């Protein structure tokens, strides 16, 4: 009963300073704030049992928690990093072969290649170069995959076809196409399996997961034939009571066979080929991704070092680090040891631009262009070596001759900086009046000026009372009076049915009668020169 004793002491004495709470036991700050409201009135020189129970249970600074997270992280070895890199490469090669394991993947490849041969893109933008100068080689090489395919079409009738679809894949592996074309068939390959797997959710889940169908009966039926009705539409003579329940969906999951034969057609070959193709892909792919995840772990020590110097330019320290990580992971996709290098020197390029491209983006309440922040950081630095050099200070004219800019393109940037003041700033007087307590309004109608205008629509109503029905109505017509209004002069020509020209005559007649001194002197009151 240590802290239980100290809280007993708090209920005894009723005020406990840092001496006890430091010597009766960060978590220090946390526990003092908790002991505040037994209530105890702690100081520095349903809660009593509630706070007692929370003080009976024995840091959350996310920086401390982040160090503790990183505790099981350690610098990775150089050629070990090469090993992780080659593992990533093996994963990307698994994914490449997987897409080349899909023949119609290469078919859509030829589709895009023809569209760029029909000029639907750029001959150097169809791919990020082959793994080898002039496109007619790589293009004819793509054309080789064209002919290398139609030589493959002769042989699904299977011994000579399987190693012919791959020869256009082994050539495929020696290429490097742009990721958008890469991810399209991939994200179509991602679409391919969701379509087929969803079918078995219509195929199998509507048998194995509803009709009390044991796992053996579908797997012992489906996988082995896997395409026709011999595995599904033959199960309804299983001598079973649940295979008897295979009738109500027999025309429905047979549709799911109508969708699979589409998918076998859509895949061009058996779905189990396509299955272990993209199964193999994401099998290595996750491992491939797993390889990248491993490497990013052992480089955050760089990023905490990088961000150690950008900190106090108005950005939260855990905000610098997260932007730091974003570059560190983006480079894992881009760093290549294929030259033979250390990732350490490569990373800080990306991680520097990460912090700084962000620091100029989301580090003020008024945002500014990086090319303007390009300017301000160029002045403030060039301000240094001129203030330190010339003597007193760089006048904006003096900056005009260091930087030959017009000095009214400069001086506007020197008006740009100095982000707004905290309106909760405490003003003097020791009165606790904040700054915002004196910033007045400009939207308010001056209470007198409202009081004025209420007579205006009254007073103009006065003279407009003693008008003719035409002039009184036409002026309310002509001007924006007592309605959603201001109908144009042609518009008043229509409603009053007189003339676009005649209206201005009576309109001219209108105030010409109202231009009488000693007749409309009321609005003469609303004049002050």
């Amino acid at each position: 009963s240590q802290l239980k004793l100290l809280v007993t002491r708090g209920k005894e004495q009723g005020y406990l300073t840092y001496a006890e709470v430091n010597d009766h036991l960060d978590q220090i700050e946390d526990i003092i704030q908790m002991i505040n409201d037994m209530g105890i009135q702690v100081m520095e020189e349903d809660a009593a049992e509630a706070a007692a129970q929370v003080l009976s249970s024995v840091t959350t600074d996310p920086v401390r928690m982040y160090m503790r997270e990183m505790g099981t992280v350690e610098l990775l070895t150089r050629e070990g990093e090469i090993d992780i890199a080659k593992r990533i490469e093996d994963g990307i090669n698994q994914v490449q072969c997987s897409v080349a394991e899909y023949p119609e993947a290469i078919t859509y490849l030829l589709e895009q290649y023809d569209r760029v041969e029909a000029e639907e893109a750029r001959l150097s933008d169809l791919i990020t170069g082959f793994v080898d100068i002039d496109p007619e080689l790589a293009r004819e090489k793509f054309a080789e995959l064209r002919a290398q395919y139609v030589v493959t079409r002769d042989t699904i009738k299977h011994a000579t076809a399987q190693e012919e679809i791959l020869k256009l894949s082994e050539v495929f592996k020696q290429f490097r196409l742009v990721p958008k074309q890469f991810d399209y068939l991939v994200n179509s390959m991602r679409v391919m399996m969701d379509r087929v797997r969803t079918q078995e959710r219509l195929i199998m889940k509507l048998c194995v997961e509803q009709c009390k169908m044991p796992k053996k009966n579908f797997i012992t039926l489906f996988t082995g034939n896997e395409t026709s009705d011999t595995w599904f539409n033959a199960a309804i003579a299983m001598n079973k009571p649940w295979s008897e329940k295979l009738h109500d969906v027999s025309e429905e999951v047979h549709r799911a066979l109508q969708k699979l034969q589409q998918i076998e057609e859509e895949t061009g070959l058996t779905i189990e080929q396509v299955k272990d193709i993209n199964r193999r892909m994401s099998i290595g792919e996750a491992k491939a991704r797993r390889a990248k995840k491993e490497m990013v772990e052992a480089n955050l020590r760089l990023v905490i070092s990088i961000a150690k110097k950008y900190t106090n330019r108005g950005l939260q320290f855990l905000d610098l680090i997260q932007e730091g990580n974003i570059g560190l992971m983006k480079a894992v996709d881009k760093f290549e040891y294929r030259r033979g290098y250390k990732f350490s020197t490569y990373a800080t390029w990306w991680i520097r631009q990460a912090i700084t491209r962000s620091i100029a983006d989301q580090a003020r309440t008024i945002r500014i262009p990086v090319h303007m922040i390009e300017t301000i950081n160029k002045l403030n630095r060039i301000s240094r070596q001129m203030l330190q050099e010339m003597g007193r200070e760089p006048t904006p004219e003096e900056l005009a001759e260091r930087m030959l800019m017009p000095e009214d393109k400069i001086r506007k940037v020197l008006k740009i900086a100095k982000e707004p003041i905290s309106m909760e700033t405490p003003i003097g007087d020791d009165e606790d009046s904040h700054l915002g307590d004196f910033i007045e309004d400009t939207t308010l109608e001056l209470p007198l000026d409202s009081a004025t205008t209420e007579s205006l629509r009254a007073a103009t109503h006065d003279v407009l009372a003693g008008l003719t029905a035409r002039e009184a109505k036409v002026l309310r017509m002509r001007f924006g009076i007592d309605m959603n209004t201001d109908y144009t002069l042609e518009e008043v020509g229509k409603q009053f049915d007189v003339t676009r020209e005649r209206i201005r005559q009576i309109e001219a007649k209108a105030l010409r009668k109202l231009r009488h001194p000693s007749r409309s002197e009321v609005l003469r009151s609303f004049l002050d020169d």
Binding site: Y18, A19, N22, D23
Partner: protein
């Protein structure tokens, strides 16, 4: 402002022991075996009002 310690902990950390510490901080009342009923030396003003 840190955790409290028994004060002579620093002194034991200060290369000190029982004898010379209790010498430095108190006086010396010497009992002896003078063969008969523990004959004791005393200072007359050392033992005033009591």
């Amino acid at each position: 402002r840190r955790r409290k310690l028994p004060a002579t902990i620093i002194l034991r950390a200060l290369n000190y022991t029982t004898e010379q510490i209790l010498d430095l901080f108190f006086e010396k009342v010497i009992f002896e075996i003078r063969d008969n009923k523990l004959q004791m030396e005393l200072v007359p003003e050392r033992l005033r009002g009591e």
